[PDB]
Design a protein around this ligand. Structure first.
Ligand SMILES: Nc1ncnc2c1ncn2[C@@H]1O[C@H](COP(=O)(O)O)[C@@H](O)[C@H]1O
Ligand SMILES: [Mg+2]
Lengths: 206, 52, 22, 576, 105, 49, 57
DNA sequence: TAACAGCTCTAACAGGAATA
RNA sequence: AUUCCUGUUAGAGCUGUUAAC
DNA sequence: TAACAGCTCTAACAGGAATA
RNA sequence: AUUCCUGUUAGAGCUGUUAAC
């Protein structure tokens, strides 16, 4: 596919949302032919660097957030991957990334226990005009009864000013995690749960 | 300690030996950035192969 | 004297027959 | 040395054979091995300090094993299955407390998890029936003691380190059988299991082994070396006059995986003039099973315990017919004894040869090999000339059921004889499909009165049915009613099996009428099948199935005639 | 998901092993969403009959053994289930199989 | 490994039965089974029994 | 009890060792490739100091 | 080890639908 | 392969019984 | 609710490549 | 954004201790 021309034009306008939507519409020619290809290789030229990163917007983040609900992986490639001197480093990186994005598993934890689920919660800052916004999301890296292993993240959710999940929100996200683990292991309880939080646990949160 | 040490080795996006944090922490951070940028993702859970 | 851990080991090796005074 | 030659050598001289069994037989006795003990100790050690639920995670899981081993390696402990590890973990867990160590080793190897298998029982039988007199062991649990107590019913004299010198005296006064544990029972204070204790040998047990070397030859099984004290004791035993009168037979489950220590000891023994041989005979259990198999004149009393499968269990009796009753298709043949003719051949004959002679000559008689013939002598004279016939005499089969059960040739012969008898005087044609016999209504005589009842059996809604004819959509296939008749040996009885079938005139073109065979048999339900079976009973026997004992003889006009008697009523049994 | 068109070429070539491998390889789009579904209904068109069953091979067993270590239950559907005269027969069988493979008992 | 006949030998039958009751014990917190039914399409040899 | 073996399901459901809120896992013995940290211990368990009283906040 | 006897099984096909 | 097991066509596997080698 | 102290983390940039 | 997380520049959130409203 070819990037539609107006993207270049909006590159002058410095509108990140418009550029991301135009890129999605450029890839829209690949929506019907999802079976033909496994991984898409979106390339963002250095000339688009003005919209690469600016306050309140992340170009790769927005692109992947737009493409994920459509269920087609992308491995965004910028000039960095080309620039980078050591070729073997980048080649290992891209090769492993593409193989794992296709659906394969390059490697797995040896002798990993399938009855333990390792939860991990993190957060991010959105600089609101009036206050701040804390976005908290969880991730799981458990190993199902099969041979492959799973790795899934999800939002913890309406508005949060502090990164500490309350009783309701934390019990909800942990119940969702428990259902996720149950779905893979036929319904067996996780005999041990690990939770890695970047900040301390509150009394109510425990 | 062993769980975290082993978890810092299964980041496929990373092409080096290990990381500073378990893959749970780094992927939760990445998805936190993704959700913060785009509020209309909160409904569904996503695999690591999309955002890695 | 003995460390609590070795006391635990000895209790667990033979707990079928050991008293409890409170 | 190949295993078979070793078996022959052992069988030739089995009255002078010490055995040596250390920690290898216990693997198959249901008790944990050295590695299992090490992993159990690691499990307790890890669960103790790092507070983790003991029963939550098992020990034979791969993930938990790897995690525990990684923890052990974290504290600088030995890496993996390396020397000075088993003793190391024992001395680590029990911090030099030999009483607690003994109690744990007793609990792990206790006499409740042990389930004797064929190997230990066979060795105990060899001990009792007095072929092997001395059984040395580096093993603590009382597997051989329990096996001997179970088989012989006599108390076995076990020797250990407490008494120590007790075994030597027993050897000198020939108080066989002796079972001296080189490392002693766990019921006593000294166990000699840690590496520091494994460098020395008890003086009196050493002397006993040296003295026993001259008297017998050694067979050592389930032993992989790795012990310095036992190896040096064996080497010292080699370095003496006529060290082994019957050779040291070192057996391993696999020659390839055998440690180099065993091989170099064997080479040293060969260099010292003894005939020591290293053989591979598979596992200890299979070795002892074969050895017991080659044993001659084993007493029945002990063999009833050596191989409990050899005796026949589940002889659960059946109740009476007292108090709806299924009516099977089995006609009981109450004939118990029959007479047959035997011909003696000047040259050996093959059953195949007799079968082809039957095919060529086509005589009016029956013959089988075991040569038993049923019929007239002149027919046999047609088959066999006077030159090849030595004599012709008689044979009596006192127990027909046991005879047919024992030899399948007798089964086939009696089945053919009863089939010929049943179809001797009747118009129903006799055919064969594969190895079964079929009595089929003939095409021409289908209008007989004796078939009319059968015509009633197949009839629809009580009208007149059809017995023989042509298929609805076949070019030349012809069909008829028939019954497959067979001989079944059940327990101590013989029965005739009748099954209604649709015979097809071309043998190889039966499948083309399959749908028809299906279509004709779609609605042959319980009532219809009952009617057909009754009609076939009437046709084959001439009497209805009530209180009848019709007797039929084959070749009644022949000197050798078989006279069977089959009850006309099929098997039945009222419900309880 | 949609099976690769190379499956048709392999079926025309009459290669059961490669056909089973291609059917399994078609599952990657669903494997990126293995958490999403419980039971996968794999359909086989009649044009693949040449590789359904022949000597030294069986496609159903190969597929089951290939997807068993991947933990995803699979309910294979042939054209027979479609063209069976009755409908409640097929519905009861398929529904009880689906419930057993998604959950159990 | 390889089997030329459908009758298990002594070691193979013992190993399979060991795996079976170990599975039962794992599913029964270590409790021993009291009744065991081994249904086979062919007759048990002496080794299997 | 956390290391007693072969306990029935009902009993474990009944007790479950409640829950451990104030986690306190023992530090091992000093033991004997050591690591040298940058921390200097302070053994001054108490110090003396002065207080001034103010008539206004 | 080569035939022969029986008892029983699976391996490929084909195949129609619950007393009419 | 939603199912079921009814047959057909074959071969093996065990037991045996002889002849051996 | 307004300061103050500490602990800790993320937000934006910039930035070189593994004992020399 | 193949990657890694070392720095810089800032701000926020948690705790506390005061002053109150
Ligand atoms: N079933 C068996 N029959 C004979 N020897 C065995 C058997 N199982 C294990 N062994 C031997 O026993 C040795 C282990 O004994 P050890 O490690 O000295 O306690 C192994 O090296 C095996 O050669
Ligand atoms: Mg990437």
């Amino acid at each position: 596919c070819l990037a539609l021309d107006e993207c270049h034009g909006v590159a002058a306008n410095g509108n990140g949302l418009a550029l991301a939507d135009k890129i999605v519409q450029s890839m829209s020619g690949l929506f019907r032919q999802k079976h033909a290809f496994d991984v898409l290789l979106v390339y963002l030229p250095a000339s688009w660097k003005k919209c690469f990163e600016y306050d309140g917007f992340d170009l790769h983040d927005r692109i992947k957030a737009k493409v994920a609900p459509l269920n087609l992986p992308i491995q965004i490639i910028n000039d960095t991957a080309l620039t980078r001197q050591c070729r073997a480093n980048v080649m290992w990186g891209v090769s492993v990334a593409l193989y794992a994005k296709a659906g394969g598993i390059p490697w797995k934890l040896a002798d990993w226990d399938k009855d333990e689920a390792y939860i991990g919660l993190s957060y991010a800052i959105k600089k609101n005009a009036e206050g701040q916004e804390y976005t908290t999301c969880c991730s799981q890296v458990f190993d199902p009864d099969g041979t492959g292993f799973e790795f899934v993240a999800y939002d913890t959710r309406d508005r949060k000013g502090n990164p500490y999940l309350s009783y309701q929100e934390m019990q909800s996200v942990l119940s969702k995690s428990l259902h996720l683990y149950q779905s893979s292991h036929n319904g067996r309880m996780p005999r041990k749960i690990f939770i890695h939080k970047t900040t301390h646990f509150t009394e109510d949160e425990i | 300690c062993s769980s975290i040490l082993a978890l810092t080795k299964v980041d496929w996006n990373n092409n080096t030996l290990y990381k500073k944090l378990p893959v749970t922490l780094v992927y939760s951070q990445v998805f936190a950035d993704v959700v913060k940028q785009t509020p209309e993702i909160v409904n569904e859970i996503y695999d690591y192969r999309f955002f890695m | 004297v003995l460390t609590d851990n070795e006391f635990y080991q000895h209790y667990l090796q033979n707990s079928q027959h050991m008293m409890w005074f409170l | 040395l190949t295993d078979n030659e070793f078996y022959q050598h052992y069988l030739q001289n089995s009255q002078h054979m010490m055995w040596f069994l250390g920690a290898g037989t216990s693997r198959s006795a249901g008790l944990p091995t050295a590695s299992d003990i090490i992993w159990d100790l690691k499990h307790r050690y890890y669960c103790l300090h790092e507070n983790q639920d003991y029963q939550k995670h098992d020990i034979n899981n791969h993930a938990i094993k790897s995690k525990i081993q990684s923890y052990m390696d974290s504290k600088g402990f030995p890496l993996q299955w390396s020397p000075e590890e088993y003793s190391f973990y024992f001395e680590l867990v029990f911090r030099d407390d030999y009483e607690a160590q003994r109690k744990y080793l007793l609990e792990a190897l206790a006499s409740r998890k042990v389930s004797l298998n064929i190997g230990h029982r066979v060795l105990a039988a060899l001990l009792e029936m007095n072929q092997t007199k001395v059984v040395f062991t580096t093993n603590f649990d009382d597997v051989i003691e329990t096996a001997f107590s179970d088989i012989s019913g006599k108390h076995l004299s076990v020797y250990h380190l407490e008494g120590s010198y007790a075994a030597l005296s027993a050897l000198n006064t020939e108080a066989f059988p002796i079972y001296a544990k080189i490392h002693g029972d766990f019921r006593y204070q000294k166990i000699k299991n840690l590496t520091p204790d494994l460098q020395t040998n008890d003086r009196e047990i050493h002397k006993c082994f040296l003295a026993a070397a001259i008297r017998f030859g050694l067979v050592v099984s389930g032993y992989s070396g790795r012990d310095e004290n036992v190896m040096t004791m064996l080497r010292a035993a080699i370095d003496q006059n006529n060290a082994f009168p019957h050779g040291l037979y070192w057996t391993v489950p696999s020659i390839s995986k055998s440690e180099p220590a065993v091989q170099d000891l064997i080479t040293y023994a060969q260099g010292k003039g003894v005939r020591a041989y290293l053989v591979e005979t598979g596992t200890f259990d299979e070795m002892l099973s074969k050895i017991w198999r080659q044993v001659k004149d084993k007493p029945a009393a002990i063999d009833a315990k050596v191989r409990t499968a050899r005796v026949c269990p589940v002889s659960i009796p059946l109740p009476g017919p007292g108090k709806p009753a299924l009516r099977t298709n089995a006609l009981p043949v109450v004939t118990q004894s029959i007479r047959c003719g035997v011909v003696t051949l000047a040259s050996p004959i093959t059953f195949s040869e007799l079968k082809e002679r039957i095919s060529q000559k086509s005589p009016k008689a029956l013959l089988t090999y075991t040569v038993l013939f049923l019929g007239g002598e002149p027919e046999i004279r047609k088959i066999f000339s006077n030159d090849e016939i030595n004599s012709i005499g008689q044979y009596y089969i006192d127990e027909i059921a046991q005879s047919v059960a024992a030899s399948t040739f007798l089964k086939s012969f009696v089945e053919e004889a009863i089939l010929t008898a049943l179809l001797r005087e009747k118009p129903i044609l006799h055919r064969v499909r594969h190895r079964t016999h079929y009595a089929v209504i003939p095409n021409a005589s289908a209008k007989d009165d004796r078939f009319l009842d059968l015509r009633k059996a197949v009839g629809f809604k009580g009208d007149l049915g059809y017995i023989t004819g042509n298929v609805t959509n076949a070019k030349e296939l012809s069909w008829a009613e028939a019954v497959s008749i067979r001989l079944e040996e059940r327990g101590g009885k013989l029965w005739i099996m009748l099954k209604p079938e649709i015979w097809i005139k071309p043998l190889d073109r039966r499948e083309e009428a399959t749908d028809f065979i299906r279509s004709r048999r779609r609605y042959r339900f319980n009532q219809c099948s009952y009617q057909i079976l009754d009609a076939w009973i009437k046709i084959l026997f001439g009497s209805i199935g009530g209180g009848g004992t019709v007797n039929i003889s084959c070749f009644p006009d022949a000197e050798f005639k078989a006279e069977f008697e089959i009850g006309t009523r099929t098997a039945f049994s009222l419900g309880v």
